Amino acid sequence: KSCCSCCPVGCAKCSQGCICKEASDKCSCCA
């Protein structure tokens, strides 16, 4: 885990702020 369970790796969109709050197995706001 880095930021979320869908972007557990300081994802870009999740650079410095888990701005991804939607993905119960997959997201479409980032990757």
Site string for Cd ion, 2-31 (x = CB under 5 A): -xx-xx---x-xx---x-x------x-xx-
Q: Tell me which residue of 5, 28, 3 sits closest to 17, measured CA to CA.
A: 3
Question: How many angstroms separate the CA atoms of 27 and 22, rounded?
Answer: 6
- For Cd ion, the closer of residues 24 and 29 by Cβ is 29
The dihedral built from the CA positions of residue 8, 30, 24 and 3, taken in this order, carries a sign that is positive
Which stretches of the chain bind Cd ion, using CB under 5 A? Answer: 3-4, 6-7, 11, 13-14, 18, 20, 27, 29-30
Question: Annotated binding site for a divalent metal cation: which residue ranges?
Answer: 3-4, 6-7, 11, 14, 18, 20, 27, 29-30
